[PDB]
Ligand binder design. Sequence first.
Ligand SMILES: CCCCCCCCCCCCCCCCCC(=O)OC[C@H](COP(=O)([O-])OCC[N+](C)(C)C)OC(=O)CCCCCCCCCCCCCCCCC
Ligand SMILES: CCCCCCCCCCCCCCCCCC(=O)OC[C@H](COP(=O)(O)OCCN)OC(=O)CCCCCCCCCCCCCCCCC
Ligand SMILES: CCCCCCCCCCCCCCCCCC(=O)OC[C@H](COP(=O)(O)OCCN)OC(=O)CCCCCCCCCCCCCCCCC
Ligand SMILES: CCCCCCCCCCCCCCCCCC(=O)OC[C@H](COP(=O)(O)OCCN)OC(=O)CCCCCCCCCCCCCCCCC
Ligand SMILES: CCCCCCCCCCCCCCCCCC(=O)OC[C@H](COP(=O)(O)OCCN)OC(=O)CCCCCCCCCCCCCCCCC
Ligand SMILES: CCCCCCCCCCC1=C(C)C(=O)C(OC)=C(OC)C1=O
Ligand code: SF4
Ligand code: SF4
Ligand code: SF4
Lengths: 360, 70, 314, 97, 176, 110, 80, 156
Amino acid sequence: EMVRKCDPHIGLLHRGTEKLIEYKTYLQALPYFDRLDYVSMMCNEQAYSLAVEKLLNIQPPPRAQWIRVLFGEITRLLNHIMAVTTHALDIGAMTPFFWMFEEREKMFEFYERVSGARMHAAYVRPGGVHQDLPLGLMDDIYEFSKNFSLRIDELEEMLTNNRIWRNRTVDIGVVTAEDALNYGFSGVMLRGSGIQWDLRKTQPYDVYDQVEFDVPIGSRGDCYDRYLCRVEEMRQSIRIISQCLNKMPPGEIKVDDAKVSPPKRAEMKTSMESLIHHFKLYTEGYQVPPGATYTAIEAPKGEFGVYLVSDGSSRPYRCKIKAPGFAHLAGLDKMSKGHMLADVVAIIGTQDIVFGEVDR
Amino acid sequence: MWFEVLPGIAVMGVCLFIPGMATARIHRFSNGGREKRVAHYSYQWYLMERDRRVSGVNRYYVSKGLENID
Amino acid sequence: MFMINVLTLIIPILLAVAFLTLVERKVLGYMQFRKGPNVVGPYGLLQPIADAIKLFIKEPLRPATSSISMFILAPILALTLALTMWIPLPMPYPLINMNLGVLFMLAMSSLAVYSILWSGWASNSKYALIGALRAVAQTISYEVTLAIILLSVLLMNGSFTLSTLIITQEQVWLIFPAWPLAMMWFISTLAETNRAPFDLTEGESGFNVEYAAGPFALFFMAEYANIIMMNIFTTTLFLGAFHNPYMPELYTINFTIKSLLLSITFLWIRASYPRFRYDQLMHLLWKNFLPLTLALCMWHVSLPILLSSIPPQT
Amino acid sequence: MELLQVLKRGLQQVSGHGGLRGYLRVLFRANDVRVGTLVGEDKYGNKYYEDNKQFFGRHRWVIYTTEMNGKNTFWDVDGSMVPPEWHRWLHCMTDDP
Amino acid sequence: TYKYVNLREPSMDMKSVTDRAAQTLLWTELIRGLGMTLSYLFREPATINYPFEKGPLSPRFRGEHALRRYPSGEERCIACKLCEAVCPAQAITIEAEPRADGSRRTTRYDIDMTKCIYCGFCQEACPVDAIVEGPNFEFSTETHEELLYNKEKLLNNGDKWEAEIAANIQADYLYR
Amino acid sequence: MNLMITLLTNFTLATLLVTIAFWLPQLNVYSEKTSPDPMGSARLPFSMKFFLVAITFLLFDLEIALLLPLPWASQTTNLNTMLTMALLLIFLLAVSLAYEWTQKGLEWTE
Amino acid sequence: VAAFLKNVWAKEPVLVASFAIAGLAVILPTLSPYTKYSLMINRATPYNYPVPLRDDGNMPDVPSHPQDPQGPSLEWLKRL
Amino acid sequence: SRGEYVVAKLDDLINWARRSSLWPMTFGLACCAVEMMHMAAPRYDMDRFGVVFRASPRQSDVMIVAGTLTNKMAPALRKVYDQMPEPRYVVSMGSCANGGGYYHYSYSVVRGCDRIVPVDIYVPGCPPTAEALLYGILQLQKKIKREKRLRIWYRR
Ligand SMILES: CCCCCCCCCCCCCCCCCC(=O)OC[C@H](COP(=O)([O-])OCC[N+](C)(C)C)OC(=O)CCCCCCCCCCCCCCCCC
Ligand SMILES: CCCCCCCCCCCCCCCCCC(=O)OC[C@H](COP(=O)(O)OCCN)OC(=O)CCCCCCCCCCCCCCCCC
Ligand SMILES: CCCCCCCCCCCCCCCCCC(=O)OC[C@H](COP(=O)(O)OCCN)OC(=O)CCCCCCCCCCCCCCCCC
Ligand SMILES: CCCCCCCCCCCCCCCCCC(=O)OC[C@H](COP(=O)(O)OCCN)OC(=O)CCCCCCCCCCCCCCCCC
Ligand SMILES: CCCCCCCCCCCCCCCCCC(=O)OC[C@H](COP(=O)(O)OCCN)OC(=O)CCCCCCCCCCCCCCCCC
Ligand SMILES: CCCCCCCCCCC1=C(C)C(=O)C(OC)=C(OC)C1=O
Ligand code: SF4
Ligand code: SF4
Ligand code: SF4
């Protein structure tokens, strides 16, 4: 019954994404990031956007940063619904899958109202966001958030005190803190081990130093504390969404440098400079000053990083993508020793593994 | 809503109602309008075979009462 | 006339198993905040018919079998045993009124692991054989608590006669003196039929994956016949209804409603829990249900003696 | 008792579709028997209905025509049969038919 | 600024121990889970009646492509090839020439719909609102080359969906 | 006799449905298929633990076979001896379960 | 004797219930006043024919008829 | 004639039973798996069409190729296709399964799954919405509804 060795062969979804980035411009390479962690689309958009904006030495406007944090936490709800409900579905609890994908359908409606696509929005861009919020969107985000805690409560009713769920998670995949730090784990994989680390707190980006929230911390390093950390991160995402809906500022949504962000279509059709800048930003693209950055965010799976190397042209010379799931699935072999074959699917569930970002 | 599942439950419940209703009506048809004689023990079978012998028609359920004596 | 009675037993078994699939898809639909089938028939009432016609003209999967003969015998044995478990069931009168109907059902259900074992060996897949051995070990494990719980209940009955079990429960349901036996019995019947949360033939290969769509449908309908049958047997055994001998249809309506609610309780348990790991339901049997079952067997031996409540033999 | 009101709503769903025949027509074509306010009808015969007491997604629907562009669509209804002027309204891109 | 999930010590008085033992022997949380599943059983489901009921879309929705016209019948596309320069998947193939009235127009406007990533960079690169990504999402084909649209197919999608496309642009052009 | 008729009917209907399920789709002429498992060709490794749980089943099943005449044995007039031997058999089944516990026999299939 | 009992009831309530029910099944029939009536009812159940005795002339306790006063009675069973 | 009428009615019966009981095997390769899961989610609910959720590959009727097909997995796709019993259909979902998509010019991507398996319905999108995939499944049912197996068998 025991597992002695687990060798995950990957590359079944290796697409050569970051070589295709080298032959495309920066705006052109943005929609590859929707398709890496394909349950966390706008967060990977945000990590790439922060990388390019760090290399461009410009900053988004405040309302764009609040829209990015709002949709980052909506995206975090999307990913932890996917994580928890498929992790329960593979073990056998199939019913909160269907209970929570209606809420996930409503958040895809939020994505589609703001961008036009339900999943791959191409909405968070270097320079801000692509388009302003349509009217009445924040009312419906409030109507979603007002009811979503009851959905978390009935998910947590179905799983948390369930003795069958606790038998499949409590002494499964115990990770020590030192081995989690050595194996390159990040996010919940560190936080179940008791490591107090969260990039929204320690190395904060857009306006996460202005929102107030808590970091759930595990005690035993197992599947069950990581389950509880993801449920409590859905709680804290609802908290941050409330703070973003109340503290949304007025103003513009792109940076007002028209050599980086494209001008408005009314002034593209009126001004000569704006038509030239629209032309060149949609044909050549902006030139990025030469340099290499490693920009990391706290994606809902952990540290999601871009090592972006620019040579001074309008196309990336190099774009290495650090996914959390790569080091997590590398540590799968240590996490599965001394367990059974039916525990392996639970350990593959507790490491939130999407193979698009694992394989690129 | 939830009462949409009730037609299938009704069909399945009629299908479970059929065997017992059928065996009750067949036992009353095959045994003179009465229950089937339960003979689990050899005394009950002895009485039943005695009924078959005293009926005179080779049917155990055809009962003969006080009219059969003088 | 008796052959008509056999057909009116076993053709409604197949129809109730046919529409149990629809009831399962519908009830699992609404418990999962969706609908079940409602397109194919009006309210989805033609979904089992359409699915039967689909499965019986699907291409034969054509396996290389280690044994052709046992590959044929395992569906035959599964369907024969799943149809012969019904014949002593007093509802209110059994088809075959036998003196030892309880022990007959325990024996014919103990024979049902040979279909799993023969289909696992008759496949050439070694992993299918491992799954068959796990399923057989699970089933024979829970048969132990079946036999001992069933003995401890029939210590209040007086005999192995299933029709006497209606007379036993005329004043009160037998779930009142034996609800711990009833709850371990109910979970043991849940683990006999390989029903969730004990379905490791779908937990990550089944023992019967090398069969074509027809024969796998025959295994599937034998499994659902076993499910409805064990719910009827649990209803007869713990929830025994009122029986007017001049109006037998009152008992038939009452046990039918109770057996439907118990089958829907199976459907509602699979919509609620994750699976056990295999060692965890082994732990559930050997280290939890079996010590309580032995203790309650001592209690239900000694209890009719200490209260002067020994049931009659006849 | 409120179950009587439920049975009366079922019987007036039978009444609202023009009798048992129209009831069974919409039952076997739509798999749905609730009545709605007839918002409109296009040049093909598709009938567009509101019911703002239904939840968001059920509140606007189309009963497709039985014959469109020479093709029998009594059983072969199709999501692409909706003309573009009703496609904003049916997909809730606007409040206005 | 952090909290401890699962750092509770259970109480060891006889009351709490007997509570946990009644939970263990009487399956109280399992009845709680059955209660929540029973609670969704009696809810109205979220199931819309497709194809008669449709999922709610916004006017920003990015579906099938269409070449548009002016309100005179003249096609808006003036062959500038900005859409195929920005096209991240290189789905757009454009060839142009001056036509008989000397106007700058395309002779080829192809979109491979099986390369297209439906991101709408073409309709925002377009300076004259010629290419748009309209509201049709129900255009599944039976053959691969039926998803290889040429200029004739795209102009026919424009003529087909223009009454809807113009109203969607009318709703969303002040955000663009 | 009615039991033998019922067994023959159930067996005949099962054999008829199995014959239909194995020979109704054989009438089609679909296509010949060339068609060239988690273990590839490694021989089935023996599990000691599955054999031990099957033997534990067999021994407890024999103890169950001893326990089966109790609803009849309660009718005796030597009730003190009957109750003593019934409690002794269930106690020896419990001692068998306890020894199976304490020597780690119920482990990794607990 | 009390801390160990609360310990095993906290850890293993299945086994505490098992040994408790088994202990009641062992000790409680010896403490019950109705164990005697189980014996008396099992000997009052007439499976066999009551083969009569030849009247030698001196048997004052054996009746001549079922409705005679002498003989074993079942008033205790009808009353209880 | 009588025989043409009988084989027409039997064609209608078997096409009804096949299109009303489609069982899919979904290759959840990439982002289109998320949208197939939304097509199974309670808003759209494929299970009310008789389309079950995640049938096993040796009993499924249709293979939904939902995601990017890479070169490393194309023999696994073809092996699962060869293990499906007939009649088997293939729905190609989304741009990478249709033509390679956003990874068309990659060294490691099969340029459409139609280079590997025969394809019946091409469902376009990146991803196509769950409603668009359900449209493609209903179009597959319409394609099954007009099959003429027994009429061609009677005419051969
Ligand atoms: C027949 C009609 C229905 C009957 C009722 C059933 C309806 C409810 C079903 C709910 C869904 C269940 C799905 C499967 C659940 C499987 C998990 C599970 O429950 O495992 C069993 C659990 C297992 O517990 P566990 O495994 O979680 O506990 C941990 C155990 N260790 C420490 C070993 C790891 O409980 C049992 O085994 C108990 C079985 C029933 C016990 C009944 C005891 C009655 C009271 C006796 C007396 C007590 C007082 C002491 C003496 C006093 C004398 C005066
Ligand atoms: C113990 C009780 C057990 C009960 C089991 C059964 C439960 C469900 C009962 C049936 C429910 C309703 C069935 C309705 C079937 C569909 C009828 C229909 O509308 O078919 C339409 C179709 C094409 O019609 P067409 O004329 O082309 O339409 C164009 C009109 N301008 O025309 C056709 O397809 C042709 C006609 C087909 C009719 C099929 C009818 C259903 C078959 C059910 C079999 C079982 C019946 C009951 C058995 C037990 C009782 C005896
Ligand atoms: C001599 C002449 C006869 C020759 C032999 C034929 C024997 C009889 C076979 C059945 C009748 C023949 C016609 C079969 C159906 C043809 C019409 C049809 O397909 O109508 C479609 C209609 C539903 O329309 P649909 O396309 O599904 O639209 C989706 C909704 N928007 O569909 C419906 O409304 C429902 C269609 C139901 C089909 C009939 C019912 C199933 C078959 C029952 C008998 C066989 C099985 C018995 C039980 C098997 C075990 C369970
Ligand atoms: C691989 C082979 C094929 C596999 C599939 C088919 C076989 C498996 C499924 C069927 C199993 C058959 C079981 C037959 C016997 C069952 C036990 C039995 O007869 O119990 C009922 C009853 C006992 O109760 P009681 O009331 O005391 O007796 C009547 C007194 N008034 O006693 C009676 O009513 C007695 C009736 C007369 C005697 C009946 C004898 C039956 C024929 C011999 C056995 C047939 C099975 C052989 C094969 C077994 C499995 C391999
Ligand atoms: C005298 C009456 C008849 C008694 C015999 C019949 C009993 C009927 C039930 C049959 C039980 C059979 C199996 C018993 C095995 C006992 C040994 C055992 O299980 O020891 C291990 C256990 C710790 O479990 P572990 O090894 O860690 O397993 C993983 C689960 N945690 O260790 C423990 O859990 C400690 C278990 C011993 C303490 C139990 C105390 C219960 C006290 C109840 C009140 C007194 C009742 C009267 C009887 C005297 C009891 C000492
Ligand atoms: C004699 C044959 C009677 C009809 C066949 C049994 C009734 C129909 C069951 C169909 C079915 C359903 C719904 C089903 O969901 C399923 O998958 C789990 C099956 O197993 C392959 C089935 O067989
Ligand atoms: S939507 Fe994007 S991928 Fe498609 S044609 Fe337009 S720019 Fe190219
Ligand atoms: S569609 Fe627009 S962007 Fe493309 S070539 Fe024509 S005018 Fe230029
Ligand atoms: S068509 Fe698009 S969304 Fe779909 S799997 Fe491909 S890259 Fe992902």
